[PDB]
Design an enzyme around this catalytic site. Structure first.
Site, PDB file in Angstrom:
ATOM      1  N   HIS A  39     -20.064  11.889 -40.985  1.00 36.24           N
ATOM      2  CA  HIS A  39     -19.578  13.147 -40.432  1.00 36.24           C
ATOM      3  C   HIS A  39     -18.756  12.864 -39.121  1.00 36.24           C
ATOM      4  CE1 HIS A  39     -22.255  14.328 -37.334  1.00 36.24           C
ATOM      5  NE2 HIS A  39     -23.389  13.988 -38.116  1.00 36.24           N
ATOM      6  N   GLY A  63     -24.379  15.750 -29.938  1.00 38.03           N
ATOM      7  CA  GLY A  63     -24.008  14.461 -29.598  1.00 38.03           C
ATOM      8  C   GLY A  63     -25.142  13.512 -29.689  1.00 38.03           C
ATOM      9  N   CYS A  94     -26.198  12.660 -33.205  1.00 42.46           N
ATOM     10  CA  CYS A  94     -25.981  11.914 -34.211  1.00 42.46           C
ATOM     11  C   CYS A  94     -25.761  10.575 -34.236  1.00 42.46           C
ATOM     12  CB  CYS A  94     -25.158  12.596 -34.937  1.00 42.46           C
ATOM     13  SG  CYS A  94     -25.492  14.385 -35.155  1.00 42.46           S
TER      14      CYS A  94
HETATM   15  O1  LIG Z   1     -18.623  16.418 -31.801  1.00 37.70           O
HETATM   16  C1  LIG Z   1     -19.987  16.689 -32.332  1.00 37.70           C
HETATM   17  N1  LIG Z   1     -19.879  17.352 -33.442  1.00 37.70           N
HETATM   18  C2  LIG Z   1     -20.930  17.923 -34.341  1.00 37.70           C
HETATM   19  C3  LIG Z   1     -22.208  17.274 -34.149  1.00 37.70           C
HETATM   20  C4  LIG Z   1     -23.218  17.397 -34.666  1.00 37.70           C
HETATM   21  C5  LIG Z   1     -23.140  18.046 -35.977  1.00 37.70           C
HETATM   22  C6  LIG Z   1     -24.344  18.388 -36.719  1.00 37.70           C
HETATM   23  C7  LIG Z   1     -24.134  18.839 -38.145  1.00 37.70           C
HETATM   24  C8  LIG Z   1     -23.500  17.975 -39.375  1.00 37.70           C
HETATM   25  C9  LIG Z   1     -23.496  18.102 -40.586  1.00 37.70           C
HETATM   26 CL1  LIG Z   1     -22.360  17.135 -41.533  1.00 37.70          CL
HETATM   27  C10 LIG Z   1     -24.053  19.299 -41.011  1.00 37.70           C
HETATM   28  C11 LIG Z   1     -24.791  20.064 -40.341  1.00 37.70           C
HETATM   29  O2  LIG Z   1     -25.461  21.089 -40.980  1.00 37.70           O
HETATM   30  C12 LIG Z   1     -26.660  21.932 -40.311  1.00 37.70           C
HETATM   31  C13 LIG Z   1     -27.850  21.679 -40.926  1.00 37.70           C
HETATM   32  C14 LIG Z   1     -27.724  22.115 -42.507  1.00 37.70           C
HETATM   33  F1  LIG Z   1     -26.447  22.431 -42.486  1.00 37.70           F
HETATM   34  F2  LIG Z   1     -28.292  21.226 -43.243  1.00 37.70           F
HETATM   35  F3  LIG Z   1     -28.462  23.252 -42.608  1.00 37.70           F
HETATM   36  C15 LIG Z   1     -24.785  19.928 -38.815  1.00 37.70           C
HETATM   37  C16 LIG Z   1     -25.436  18.577 -36.276  1.00 37.70           C
HETATM   38  O3  LIG Z   1     -26.618  18.900 -36.581  1.00 37.70           O
HETATM   39  N2  LIG Z   1     -25.550  18.249 -34.805  1.00 37.70           N
HETATM   40  C17 LIG Z   1     -26.804  18.218 -34.146  1.00 37.70           C
HETATM   41  C18 LIG Z   1     -27.071  19.050 -33.221  1.00 37.70           C
HETATM   42  C19 LIG Z   1     -28.242  19.428 -32.697  1.00 37.70           C
HETATM   43  C20 LIG Z   1     -29.427  18.197 -32.900  1.00 37.70           C
HETATM   44  N3  LIG Z   1     -29.010  17.428 -33.780  1.00 37.70           N
HETATM   45  C21 LIG Z   1     -27.705  17.401 -34.558  1.00 37.70           C
HETATM   46  C22 LIG Z   1     -24.429  17.641 -33.987  1.00 37.70           C
HETATM   47  C23 LIG Z   1     -22.292  16.226 -32.934  1.00 37.70           C
HETATM   48  O4  LIG Z   1     -23.284  15.622 -32.317  1.00 37.70           O
HETATM   49  N4  LIG Z   1     -20.912  15.959 -32.161  1.00 37.70           N
END
Ligand SMILES: O=c1[nH]cc(-c2cc(-c3cc(Cl)cc(OCCC(F)(F)F)c3)c(=O)n(-c3cccnc3)c2)c(=O)[nH]1
Ligand SMILES: O=c1[nH]cc(-c2cc(-c3cc(Cl)cc(OCCC(F)(F)F)c3)c(=O)n(-c3cccnc3)c2)c(=O)[nH]1
EC number: 3.4.19.12
Lengths: 303, 303
Positions: free
Chosen positions: B41, B141, B143
């Site tokens: 992603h 950030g 991920c």
């Molecule tokens: O520039 C940046 N943009 C974005 C991120 C980012 C992106 C996602 C993300 C990605 C996808 Cl594909 C699907 C998603 O859906 C939510 C859960 C559900 F959908 F399943 F319900 C969420 C994400 O959770 N986090 C994140 C934040 C806080 C803790 N842990 C992870 C960060 C980044 O780190 N940096």
């Protein structure tokens, strides 16, 4: 989201751990530049009233075996500073980090890298208790393992492990070999003083709970510093000071909950318990996170 | 003595963490030999129904910025495997450890090295929950941060972080990019399944308590596996199997408390609570230590 007992990354310290053998005693040492630091009780046999000046006078450099990974380091000098032995070696550690030695105040936290035979085993976080012990996880052979903090890329060493007390808690020194607390490195009747809970840390952890969505313990009330400290003392909590209140400022500002407002929550929790609820996955009030630890982990600082 | 949530020393992993930027999205990647692994992603903008094959077809190597510390790494190839992006780079990581990729079973534990912008922030232990989430500590950030175990000097990577669910728990993949659990890397209605407690781990932790001198919960009774699993199911505990009993063998042997004897203790604790007592400093039954974790920490193995 989430809140965990987080240690600092340990790589910078792992590259400093060595094994120091003297006779049949083996423990860990810390190799920085061309010096190896380790507990002076490595030169003991058995130990009830050791005279370390005499014991060291009778040693020579060749009585000290220092191994770093697979290579043996040549000891070219030896001296004692307080309860630490300093062994000068022929080769400076090429992995030496930027570092400093610091003597921490009770209530401050640090990462411990537990080691055996100079080889890192695990890493965990703990706090200097008010009674100058730490509730670590240490087995025989762990002496010489160090505690540390990391700021930017500078490792601040603040603890070296020397002894386990009869209650299962742990005693050690700063890296200049001064014990935390009243302890001495000999076999005698030693016991930790009575301990107390680190109030400012409990409040910090309540703020982390709020930052992570646990609010059930909040209330509309406020308390005076004086009235709160009356309750603190009743439950064996450290007095809260204006310094502590100011340190909590940024967490208070980020959540919009005044410190003395959070103190009213803590008072209720001391008086009424949790009634079967949990905070940040705990059924007890946690006191080994500093305000700085909370900000670091709920804000994302790196090293 | 002592028992702590212990992570493995993280140095071997720290030397593998890089930053991977694609457009305005920055996250972490894992650099092993001449390949960088990161969540796919990273190539997204916004994301509700992304077609990753199309998104990647439209990219070129120069759309991927990889920084290791201060040096920029040249991407010379790119491909996708399941939900992981693999970026071939011109230089093999000189700090690559001996490593393997493994897909763990629920109930197994691992160390997480939380990173931001390719820079390690902290290390902590957690467990793969039965519902294939982890209760981590992750901010935006994070991920690309990885979970791992260390045996001898071989790093077994078992988790890469992708997403935070709405309940604040975390979802990710093995290092081949297969999600743990039913999750998918797009923005949709996703929620963890109902979770259960890891029975074999709770028993392991009771043995660690005994090994450390907490005995107040022991009793003279024994239970049948069938009778215990009847109580387990009542309290949302995973069934205990003969495999689990055999795995607990060595802890049973070291303490002399038969597994089914410990199960009678656990039954009482489920039925009657702790009555204001604690075990290993906890007011709740802990279930994120495996039998292996207990043996490692109460026996002293190094890496
Ligand atoms: O520039 C940046 N943009 C974005 C991120 C980012 C992106 C996602 C993300 C990605 C996808 Cl594909 C699907 C998603 O859906 C939510 C859960 C559900 F959908 F399943 F319900 C969420 C994400 O959770 N986090 C994140 C934040 C806080 C803790 N842990 C992870 C960060 C980044 O780190 N940096
Ligand atoms: O060969 C080796 N011999 C010996 C050790 C060793 C030695 C001591 C020690 C040293 C001194 Cl000076 C005084 C002392 O007194 C006890 C506390 C009290 F005295 F204050 F009450 C104990 C010690 O505690 N541990 C140890 C074990 C378990 C956990 N943590 C430390 C190990 C070693 O590691 N290797």
């Amino acid at each position: 989201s989430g809140f965990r007992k987080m240690a600092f990354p340990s790589g910078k310290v792992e590259g400093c751990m060595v094994q120091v053998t003297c006779g049949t005693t083996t423990l860990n040492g810390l190799w920085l530049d061309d010096v190896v630091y380790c507990p002076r009780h490595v030169i003991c046999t058995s130990m009830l009233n050791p005279n370390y000046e005499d014991l060291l006078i009778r040693k020579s450099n060749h009585n000290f075996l220092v191994q770093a990974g697979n290579v043996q380091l040549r000891v070219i000098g030896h001296s004692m500073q307080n309860c630490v032995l300093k062994l000068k070696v022929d080769t400076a550690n090429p992995k030496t980090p930027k570092y400093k030695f610091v003597r921490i105040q009770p209530g401050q936290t640090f990462s411990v890298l537990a080691c055996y035979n100079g080889s890192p085993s695990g890493v965990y976080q703990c706090a200097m208790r008010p009674n100058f012990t730490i509730k670590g996880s240490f087995l025989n052979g762990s002496c010489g393992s160090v505690g540390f903090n990391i700021d930017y890329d500078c490792v601040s060493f603040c603890y070296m492990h020397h002894m386990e007390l009869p209650t299962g808690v742990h005693a050690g020194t700063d890296l200049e070999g001064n014990f935390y607390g009243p302890f001495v490195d000999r076999q005698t009747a030693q016991a930790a003083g009575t301990d107390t809970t680190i109030t400012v840390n409990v409040l910090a952890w309540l703020y982390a709970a709020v930052i992570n969505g646990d609010r059930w313990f909040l209330n509309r009330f406020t308390t005076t510093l004086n009235d709160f400290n009356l309750v603190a003392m009743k439950y064996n909590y450290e007095p809260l000071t204006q310094d502590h209140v100011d340190i909590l400022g940024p967490l208070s500002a980020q959540t919009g909950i005044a410190v003395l407002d959070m103190c009213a929550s803590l008072k209720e929790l001391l008086q009424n318990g949790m009634n079967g609820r949990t905070i940040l996955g705990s059924a007890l009030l946690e006191d080994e996170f500093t305000p700085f630890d909370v900000v670091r982990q709920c804000s994302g600082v790196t090293f």
